[PDB]
Amino acid sequence: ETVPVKLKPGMDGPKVKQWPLTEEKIKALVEICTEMEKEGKISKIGPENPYNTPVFAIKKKDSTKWRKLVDFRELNKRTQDFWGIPHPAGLKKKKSVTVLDVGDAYFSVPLDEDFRKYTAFTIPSINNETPGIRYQYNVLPQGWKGSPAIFQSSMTKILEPFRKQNPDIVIYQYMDDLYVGSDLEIGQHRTKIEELRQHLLRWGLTELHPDKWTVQPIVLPEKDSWTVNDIQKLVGKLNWASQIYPGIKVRQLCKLLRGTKALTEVIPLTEEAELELAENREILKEPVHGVYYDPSKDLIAEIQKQGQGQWTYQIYQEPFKNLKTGKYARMRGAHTNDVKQLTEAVQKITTESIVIWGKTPKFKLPIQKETWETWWTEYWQATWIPEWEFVNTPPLVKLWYQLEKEPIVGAETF
Amino acid sequence: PISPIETVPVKLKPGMDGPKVKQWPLTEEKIKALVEICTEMEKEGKISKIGPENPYNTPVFAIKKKDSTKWRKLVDFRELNKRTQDFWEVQLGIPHPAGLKKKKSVTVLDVGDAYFSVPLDEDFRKYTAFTIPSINNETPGIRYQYNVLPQGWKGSPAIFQSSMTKILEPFRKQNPDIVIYQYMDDLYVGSDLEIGQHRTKIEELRQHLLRWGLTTPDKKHQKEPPFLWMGYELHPDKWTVQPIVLPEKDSWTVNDIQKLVGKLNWASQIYPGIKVRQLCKLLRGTKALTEVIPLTEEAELELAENREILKEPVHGVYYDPSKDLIAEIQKQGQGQWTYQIYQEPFKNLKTGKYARMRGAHTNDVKQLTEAVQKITTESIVIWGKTPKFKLPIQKETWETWWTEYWQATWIPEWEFVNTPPLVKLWYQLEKEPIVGAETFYVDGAANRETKLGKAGYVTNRGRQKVVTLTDTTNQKTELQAIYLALQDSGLEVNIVTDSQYALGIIQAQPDQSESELVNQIIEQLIKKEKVYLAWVPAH
Numbered sequence: 001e002t003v004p005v006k007l008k009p010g011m012d013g014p015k016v017k018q019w020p021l022t023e024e025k026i027k028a029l030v031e032i033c034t035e036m037e038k039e040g041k042i043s044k045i046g047p048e049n050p051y052n053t054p055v056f057a058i059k060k061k062d063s064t065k066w067r068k069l070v071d072f073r074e075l076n077k078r079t080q081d082f083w084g085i086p087h088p089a090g091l092k093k094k095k096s097v098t099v100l101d102v103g104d105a106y107f108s109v110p111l112d113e114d115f116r117k118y119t120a121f122t123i124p125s126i127n128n129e130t131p132g133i134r135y136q137y138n139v140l141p142q143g144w145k146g147s148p149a150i151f152q153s154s155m156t157k158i159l160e161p162f163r164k165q166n167p168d169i170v171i172y173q174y175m176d177d178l179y180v181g182s183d184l185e186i187g188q189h190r191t192k193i194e195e196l197r198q199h200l201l202r203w204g205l206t207e208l209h210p211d212k213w214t215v216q217p218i219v220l221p222e223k224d225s226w227t228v229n230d231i232q233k234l235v236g237k238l239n240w241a242s243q244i245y246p247g248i249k250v251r252q253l254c255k256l257l258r259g260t261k262a263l264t265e266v267i268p269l270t271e272e273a274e275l276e277l278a279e280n281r282e283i284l285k286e287p288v289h290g291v292y293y294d295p296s297k298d299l300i301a302e303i304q305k306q307g308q309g310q311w312t313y314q315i316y317q318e319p320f321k322n323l324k325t326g327k328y329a330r331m332r333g334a335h336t337n338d339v340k341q342l343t344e345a346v347q348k349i350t351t352e353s354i355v356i357w358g359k360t361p362k363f364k365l366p367i368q369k370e371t372w373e374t375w376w377t378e379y380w381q382a383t384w385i386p387e388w389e390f391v392n393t394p395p396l397v398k399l400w401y402q403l404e405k406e407p408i409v410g411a412e413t414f
Numbered sequence: 415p416i417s418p419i420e421t422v423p424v425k426l427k428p429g430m431d432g433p434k435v436k437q438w439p440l441t442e443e444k445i446k447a448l449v450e451i452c453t454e455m456e457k458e459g460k461i462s463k464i465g466p467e468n469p470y471n472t473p474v475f476a477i478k479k480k481d482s483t484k485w486r487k488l489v490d491f492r493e494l495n496k497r498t499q500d501f502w503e504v505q506l507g508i509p510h511p512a513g514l515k516k517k518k519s520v521t522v523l524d525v526g527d528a529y530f531s532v533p534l535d536e537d538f539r540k541y542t543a544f545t546i547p548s549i550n551n552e553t554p555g556i557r558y559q560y561n562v563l564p565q566g567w568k569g570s571p572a573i574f575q576s577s578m579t580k581i582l583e584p585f586r587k588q589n590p591d592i593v594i595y596q597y598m599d600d601l602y603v604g605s606d607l608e609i610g611q612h613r614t615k616i617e618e619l620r621q622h623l624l625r626w627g628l629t630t631p632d633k634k635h636q637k638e639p640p641f642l643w644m645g646y647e648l649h650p651d652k653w654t655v656q657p658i659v660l661p662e663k664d665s666w667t668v669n670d671i672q673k674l675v676g677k678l679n680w681a682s683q684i685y686p687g688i689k690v691r692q693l694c695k696l697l698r699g700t701k702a703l704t705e706v707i708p709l710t711e712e713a714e715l716e717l718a719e720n721r722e723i724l725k726e727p728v729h730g731v732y733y734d735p736s737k738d739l740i741a742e743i744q745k746q747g748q749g750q751w752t753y754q755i756y757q758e759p760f761k762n763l764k765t766g767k768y769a770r771m772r773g774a775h776t777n778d779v780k781q782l783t784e785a786v787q788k789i790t791t792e793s794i795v796i797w798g799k800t801p802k803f804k805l806p807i808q809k810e811t812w813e814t815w816w817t818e819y820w821q822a823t824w825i826p827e828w829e830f831v832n833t834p835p836l837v838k839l840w841y842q843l844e845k846e847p848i849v850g851a852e853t854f855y856v857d858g859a860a861n862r863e864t865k866l867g868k869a870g871y872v873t874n875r876g877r878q879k880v881v882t883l884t885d886t887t888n889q890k891t892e893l894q895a896i897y898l899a900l901q902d903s904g905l906e907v908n909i910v911t912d913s914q915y916a917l918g919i920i921q922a923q924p925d926q927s928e929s930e931l932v933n934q935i936i937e938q939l940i941k942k943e944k945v946y947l948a949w950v951p952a953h
């Protein structure tokens with residue numbers, strides 16, 4: 001049967017316009033949508049339905065098969081609340097997690113007849129030579145929030161058996177995904193994962209390492225000799241840095257900067273200054289105190305382009321009170337593409353956000369709206385889509401985080 | 415004679431109610447005309463005589479048009495419409511000629527009073543009620559209501575087009591090698607069949623429409639190629655740009671110069687060489703549209719030069735899916751870029767130029783980047799594809815800029831073409847302080863309230879200076895400090911500042927700005943052989 005879903009008090013349905021798509025993408029959407037139309041999942045709709053939601057095709061991670069994706073963001077946000085599952089704190093402490101797409105299970109369930117209109121989407125035609133192909137959902141839509149929600153009973157139900165068989169493992173369900181975390185070694189882990197998929201397949205469905213991340217303090221440069229400049233750069237960095245650890249002091253250094261000297265001129269370090277330095281190195285050896293995640297506050301993730309394919313991010317909720325800071329280096333293949341690295345990055349942080357807190361952070365993106373919108377879809381891979389804003393990177397913020405500690409040699413993969 | 419097509423469910427607002435505006439009183443002559451026409455429509459089955467039961471009303475009007483000077487009719491749904499539910503956006507994006515394919519033949523079928531062919535949602539119909547006034551408000555006038563899509567009513571367009579889609583669905587599947595395009599009351603059917611086959615199919619399509627009550631043209635009203643598709647004349651084999659006419663007068667008002675510059679700008683897209691600088695100039699200080707501004711020799715000349723250019727018909731080619739899509743761009747002066755998309759050399763599909771983007775602070779490369787994105791976006795829409803790019807910039811310059819810029823930026827697959835002016839990096843701030851070179855410790859300070867300030871520097875070599883400024887801001891001073899610094903420094907300079915804005919220049923290294931000041935600085939920056947900028951916290 002269908003549960004009577006509604007909209008939040010005084011909200012209306014999305015009327016978001018469809019961005020243009022590449023031909024290949026439109027072709028697939030057409031193939032894909034006719035099929036679902038036939039399977040009774042979606043139906044063509046009339047003009048009396050003025051709502052709309054963006055749609056697009058993404059490459060199912062491996063195969064040539066294109067996956068249909070919809071941007072329900074606006075709908076999700078307008079959909080009444082169900083006052084999901086409480087985040088299992090244990091997930092983050094697992095050696096290797098795996099993500100699975102259980103969005104498929106939704107088609108099996110009917111969407112309340114009255115809510116369907118609000119799910120209207122559209123397939124655009126090149127050079128606008130054909131009117132758009134208007135549809136809507138009859139079943140639970142993938143990517144909608146109400147979906148993993150209504151399908152909870154059936155979900156828990158189908159899962160239990162594997163949970164009792166292997167209670168050492170943890171299963172988290174976010175939107176269309178399923179994260180599986182166990183402490184079993186790779187082979188035994190993935191075999192068990194497959195043992196799960198098999199289990200999930202007899203209904204109709206279908207490599208993280210959480211214990212290895214989130215740290216890295218700020219290391220300060222060390223030099224044989226210091227110059228007027230070296231110091232100046234260093235003082236500006238620490239001075240900005242004081243907004244986080246007020247115990248950091250730069251007065252003694254600033255004395256060494258008394259004088260109109262050549263930037264390249266070497267300065268001898270007074271013991272007094274040298275102490276001030278060491279004392280700051282100690283303060284930086286560990287993250288700031290009193291930072292506790294607040295579930296009633298929006299989680300935030302700001303990214304900065306460090307160049308050469310490198311990037312830095314800070315997930316926090318209050319300015320300077322970071323819950324996590326990290327670094328991302330481009331993936332093999334993205335060498336001459338900024339949006340690839342960026343899209344890939346956004347995904348990773350958003351996955352870690354889920355893994356650790358069970359939600360998606362909002363992104364402050366060091367990119368231009370037009371560049372993002374034009375090409376992000378091309379490199380996307382997740383069932384979900386986080387929120388974002390485009391911002392101008394304050395030069396210091398970047399300089400600071402560029403200072404994060406990197407491995408001695410690295411994570412040795414013999 | 416109506417149709418057997420199932421209506422669309424039309425509802426009010428939300429919770430509003432149908433219009434109840436009073437019937438404008440008309441003359442015996444105007445009334446009698448409306449009486450005539452309405453009786454006609456009443457029999458064709460389009461409208462229906464109603465009564466006292468209906469409270470809703472819309473005013474009916476009577477104008478005589480050119481075609482027959484015969485009295486006609488008009489109904490003001492302004493209200494009904496503002497109370498009618500929102501429908502989905504009608505195709506507001508029309509095909510651009512560069513995106514269409516050539517057809518062996520192309521026919522335009524004009525589905526005339528198509529609106530009055532489709533049934534109205536019987537429920538909603540009451541809301542379309544109107545009344546023919548009596549000779550100066552006598553006894554009750556004649557009451558009616560629509561049973562079909564009303565001319566002027568909100569839903570009519572979206573609804574009619576939808577209907578057309580269903581109705582054409584069969585025919586389309588039945589003959590995939592035919593291509594119809596709906597727009598307004600027009601169906602544009604093109605194809606690659608031999609003319610007889612085509613003509614034949616046309617007839618089938620027609621008769622098919624007839625099977626649904628949809629009447630089609632008459633030999634007298636039959637449209638013929640070429641077709642006027644906004645600014646362009648299309649021919650199934652190629653398109654040609656309509657020769658645009660510039661008046662020659664001895665009295666140009668402001669409107670005249672504006673509207674002119676309009677048509678002029680529009681042309682700048684297609685036609686290479688159009689300029690309006692001197693024509694725009696005439697607008698300076700205009701006190702009225704009806705104001706007459708004398709054309710300076712400067713203006714009279716460019717106006718002339720343009721007339722020469724516009725006398726050349728620019729001809730064009732259509733989209734052929736079996737060949738490459740290429741786009742070449744030129745930097746027509748700072749901030750302006752020209753682009754031309756073609757598959758085969760000199761045979762263009764589309765051209766255009768992007769206006770000088772006057773803004774806060776940027777550089778060529780970023781500006782090229784944007785032009786490229788604007789193009790790509792347009793391309794994706796027109797052809798569902800992005801063009802292989804031909805750009806006047808060395809890949810060496812690109813790799814140097816992008817790989818270090820603070821903002822994520824990208825350019826699809828591309829290739830360098832040496833067609834000067836080449837876009838390049840006007841300068842590059844040193845990666846490290848310069849050994850040997852002078853070091854200017856610069857500072858500017860101004861009382862934001864009095865707008866008085868000073869600015870100067872002191873070098874490690876002794877040189878120093880200050881300059882008092884009246885009517886300035888602290889930002890300017892910090893900046894002027896830097897200007898003077900560059901002015902007096904040799905070919906290599908080291909400069910330190912606490913200016914937050916100077917930090918912005920280190921990160922973005924702009925080569926153009928809104929402020930003449932910054933610009934000047936850029937000028938000096940470009941002049942030096944080596945410049946090192948270093949920022950330090952204030953005080």
Ligand SMILES: CC(C)OC(=O)c1cc(NC(=S)OC(C)C)ccc1Cl
Pocket residue numbers: 129509513514515516517520593594595602603604639640641643648649650651
């Ligand atoms: C802009 C419209 C009104 O003009 C045409 O109908 C028209 C269309 C085409 N080409 C194509 S693909 O035809 C499209 C219908 C797909 C070629 C010449 C003309 Cl004149």
